[PDB]
Amino acid sequence: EPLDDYVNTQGASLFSVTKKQLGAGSIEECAAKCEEDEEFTCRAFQYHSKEQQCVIMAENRKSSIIIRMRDVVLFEKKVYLSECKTGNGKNYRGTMSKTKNGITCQKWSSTSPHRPRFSPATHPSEGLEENYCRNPDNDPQGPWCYTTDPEKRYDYCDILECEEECMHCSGENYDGKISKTMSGLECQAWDSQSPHAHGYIPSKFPNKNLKKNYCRNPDRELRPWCFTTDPNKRWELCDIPRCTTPPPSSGPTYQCLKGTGENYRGNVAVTVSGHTCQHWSAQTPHTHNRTPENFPCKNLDENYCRNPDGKRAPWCHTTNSQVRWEYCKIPSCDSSPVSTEQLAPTAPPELTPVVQDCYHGDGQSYRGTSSTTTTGKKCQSWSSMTPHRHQKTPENYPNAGLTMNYCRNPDADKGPWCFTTDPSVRWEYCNLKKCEDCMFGNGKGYRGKRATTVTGTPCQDWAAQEPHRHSIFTPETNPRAGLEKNYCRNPDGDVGGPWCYTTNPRKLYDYCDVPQCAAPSFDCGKPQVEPKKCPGRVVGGCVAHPHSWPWQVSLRTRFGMHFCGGTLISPEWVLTAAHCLEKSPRPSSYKVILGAHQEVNLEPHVQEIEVSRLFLEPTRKDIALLKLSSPAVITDKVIPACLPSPNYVVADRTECFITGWGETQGTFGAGLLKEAQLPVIENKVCNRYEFLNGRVQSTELCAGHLAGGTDSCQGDSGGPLVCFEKDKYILQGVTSWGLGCARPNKPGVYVRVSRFVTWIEGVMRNN
Ligand SMILES: *[C@@H]1O[C@H](CO)[C@H](O)[C@H](O[C@@H]2O[C@H](CO)[C@H](O)[C@H](O[C@]3(C(=O)O)C[C@H](O)[C@@H](NC(C)=O)[C@H]([C@H](O)[C@H](O)CO)O3)[C@H]2O)[C@H]1NC(C)=O
Ligand SMILES: [Cl-]
Ligand SMILES: [Cl-]
């Protein structure tokens, strides 16, 4: 495969009883010893990178327990976790224990109520474990088992089909291997940006299984699709066979309204305004794609009101030629303790401090809002058991402050950590500083002189084999690692940073506390005042924390009139909308005010700089660069925004903020810099019929709600659209207003800065 038949998890340790531990040089060496199946059925394996040790065990996460641990990588045989069948299920190794009639199996190792012809004695290679359904003889009828019913020798079991060959419904959970489209074009790999830049980044959506270049349905499309290797065709649906087998267990269904009516299965066929529903199977008077064929699991029967998509309530197309569709008025259900308006996760907002938060000692007392690991991954919520199950819950650790997905230290480790939202990485340390000799990143390159572990124990010399023998990480094994004397080093680029073997006889190795290098002064996109980060569901947004958006520029006329926003990109350059320059072609007609919060009564520190140059982006003419008469003085209130990497495509749902001075009369916060949190709406979704029917080009980006959020124009023309990313804010969009303001059930459209970076940096190096 080679390891495509395993599920890898870094930082995970499955505890086992029936095992075999031994020395190995590599994961592949270790994997081989697992495949060379003797004594027991190796169901999983652990590799301890720093110890050359390899554990082979017959246990799985299903049958045992996993814990957070250091260095170790866990590899679990997919086959044994796979609770579905393929063809006849010859290779099925699930846990189904009742037949298709629901009768309890007998064990393969029992001789009562039936004395079996197939057993573990006779068919050692057959997986005849417990009372579980298996196909020893490869019967075309699929898994069966001997029965606990005495007058019934065996019977077949009802194992749901494996989405390898086929898809159920619309392929939401399709994990098959088809990698070409309807037309036959080979799919572009999800982890690649060529020939198509896109927001479906696997690392951003690990749980969406955007594996290699396979057709997938991560966003409620009609069917699985992919981006294509054809530069002329961005994306296309794939041709995925539909399964004949029954779809997996889903419910409960109501004949009354509960929530958004996604579970409605009643017979109402009239809208609120009294219109007759058009049959879903019909294309007159209106053409559509919401057909029983495309959405089999949605029960789009006759012309009954249904909510097959993500709408507010049930709806239907109408037989009225003048009203394409309308919502139906379904009577709400009665009282019950399940659909009390409580279910689903949604995930918390990104409240991680930009002004890098710090911790004291081992950080067991840290109570901050940081929720980003050392590698930029998002923390999993302590109350959630997905993607990682664990016992570090507020119930088990009442005083650890285990709330939301914030970085904490419940188990008294070296510093705050969290379970990660990436299925392949159980947990990592948090991106936090501990309240010259320093490192960069994980310190693989660190060659400093620190020789002390986090506990105070000195390091053992790398050349020494006492107190600790070590077959690896000697100056001869790793000649390029700088393993001199007893200096803290990161030869293996461990996520934890520099470490060393310790002189403590009872502790083999440990981390050293090597600080991250300081940096010269003010970096782009790093406000010196923490943005308040206005929550989504607020009309008109919030008043910004003064100077929390230091790249925010106010474009003014020669008569103190604020009429536009802009973004400071460097000390002599501001990016704004070309629309801002419509009134005058004279650079002198413009005043750029920096570090302001007040719109009219400017604070004494505000910088007022005249524009000396006006450069209009030629290809689109939608944005323009303003060169300042003199360079801006960079302070804690005037800092430029970072620019994205060329063609970077902000991932769908990325939370961003639009800032600017609102021109709204009857409201609080007049003449004050405001901000509004907007999630990015990926172009493929933004472009669908229901919103902006093919009206959005790639040199643009969408941001804002699709469920009646707002109906006005946020920020200022030319104002910033910034998106936090790991450590800083990046200017992803430029407000253009005339491009299309965010209306109810439609996002706003901005100029995608990433498509104009080469032009900008171009204009900045020549002029
Ligand atoms: C998820 O996004 C949605 C929209 O898609 C919401 O914005 C949501 O915020 C929550 O709204 C719902 C109601 O629509 C909840 O009632 C929620 O409050 C809870 C929660 O369920 O997460 C209630 C609960 O007491 C507690 N969580 C538990 C017990 O798991 C916390 C919190 O302690 C209480 O709200 C305080 O009484 O939140 C709203 O906060 C988004 N989800 C988030 C932000 O997790
Ligand atoms: Cl754990
Ligand atoms: Cl038999």
Curated annotation (Swiss-Prot):
It comes from the Eukaryota. The record marks 59-60, 537-538 as: Cleavage. This is Plasminogen. It is found in: Secreted. InterPro entries: Kringle, Kringle-like, Kringle_CS, Kringle_sf, Pan_app, Pept_S1A_plasmin, Peptidase_S1_PA, Peptidase_S1_PA_chymotrypsin. GO terms for biological process: biological process involved in interaction with symbiont; blood coagulation; extracellular matrix disassembly; fibrinolysis; labyrinthine layer blood vessel development; mononuclear cell migration; muscle cell cellular homeostasis; myoblast differentiation. The modification Phosphoserine is found at residues 554, 645. The active site is at 579 (charge relay system), 622 (charge relay system), 717 (charge relay system). Residues 1-79 form the PAN domain. It comes from Homo sapiens (Human). Keywords: Blood coagulation, Cleavage on pair of basic residues, Disease variant, Disulfide bond, Fibrinolysis, Glycoprotein, Hemostasis, Hydrolase, Kringle, Phosphoprotein, Protease, Repeat, Secreted, Serine protease, Signal, Thrombophilia, Tissue remodeling, Zymogen. Transmembrane segments: none annotated. GO terms for cellular component: blood microparticle; cell surface; collagen-containing extracellular matrix; external side of plasma membrane; extracellular exosome; extracellular region; extracellular space; glutamatergic synapse. The record marks 115, 117 as: Interacts with fibrin. Changing residue 708 to R: In PLGD; Kanagawa-1; 50% activity. N-linked glycan contains N-acetyllactosamine and sialic acid. O-linked glycans consist of Gal-GalNAc disaccharide modified with up to 2 sialic acid residues (microheterogeneity). Present in plasma and many other extracellular fluids. It is synthesized in the liver. Its EC number is 3.4.21.7. The gene is PLG.
